[PDB]
């Protein structure tokens, strides 16, 4: 075909029931995720081509950056709970990867404070059991596909995008292809 299992995607040999339709994994420690977010806007551009009635989910992972990586996953839970993903994503990446000013849970916090979230509001969420189970979801979803690398995207817990099987000559083209692939898997 034009879309072929093993080329623009892979099929999980044992399906994840009840998975979110579009599910993407990243790490703020992950260099390609940086590109995917700030240079390519993959998640944005996929959303632009998805049918509607499609919810898009994004989760953080623990297996990069040790003790910080976990702090970051908790922080990302906070972002989801307070609905501020859109205000912390970029400063978190640049603090980990560009400026190198995030070295502790406290520095993670600062990003949120500077992004206008209130101290007591952050600390409260940080410690809420709502965040505990949101951390738990993130780990569970990863566990359910025995995820060992990021960036990663899964369509209805049965297809996994395979980006290395797409051209990277022209960035804009890679994205389009990536998104169209997601659209195709969406409808499958």
In 3-state terms, what secondary structure has residue 13? Answer: coil
> Which residues form the domain of 121?
1-188
Query: What does the alpha-carbon distance between residue 17 and residue 68 come to, in Å, rounded to a whole number?
Result: 31
Query: What does the alpha-carbon distance between residue 18 and residue 140 come to, in Å, rounded to a whole number?
Result: 12
* 142 closest CA partner among 79, 71, 73: 73
What was the structure determination method?
A: X-ray
Q: Specify the residue for token string 């980006």.
A: 163
Could you tell me the CATH number of the domain that includes residue 55? 3.40.30.10
Structural domain total, the chain:
1
- The pair of three-digit structure tokens given for residue 113, joined into one six-digit string: 């404070």
> To one decimal place, what's the resolution in Å?
2.7
- The pair of three-digit structure tokens given for residue 28, joined into one six-digit string: 């703020």
Whether residue 94 contacts residue 129, with contact meaning beta carbons closer than 8 Å, is answered with: no
Q: Where are the alpha helices (DSSP H) in the chain?
A: 31-34, 42-49, 66-81, 85-93, 105-114, 119-127, 129-143, 171-187
């Amino acid at each position: 075909a034009q879309y072929e299992d093993g080329k623009q995607y892979t099929t999980l040999e044992k399906p994840v029931a009840g998975a979110p339709q579009v599910l993407e994994f990243f790490s703020f420690f992950c260099p390609h995720c940086y590109q995917f977010e700030e240079v390519l806007h993959i998640s944005d551009n996929v959303k632009k081509k998805l049918p509607e009635g499609v919810k898009m989910t994004k989760y953080h992972v623990n297996f990069m950056g040790g003790d910080l990586g976990k702090d970051l996953t908790q922080a990302w839970a906070v972002a989801m709970a307070l609905g501020v993903e859109d205000k912390v994503t970029v400063p978190l990446f640049e603090g980990v990867q560009k400026t190198q000013t995030i070295r502790s849970a406290s520095d993670i916090r600062d990003v949120f404070i500077n992004a206008g979230i209130k101290g007591e509001e952050y600390d409260a969420a940080w410690n809420s059991f709502v965040v505990k189970s949101l951390v738990a979801q993130q780990e569970k979803a990863a566990a359910d596909v025995q995820l060992r690398g990021v960036p990663a995207m899964f369509v209805n817990g049965k297809y996994q995008l395979n980006p290395q099987g797409m051209d990277t000559s022209n960035m804009d083209v890679f994205v389009q292809q990536y998104a169209d692939t997601v659209k195709y898997l969406s409808e499958k």
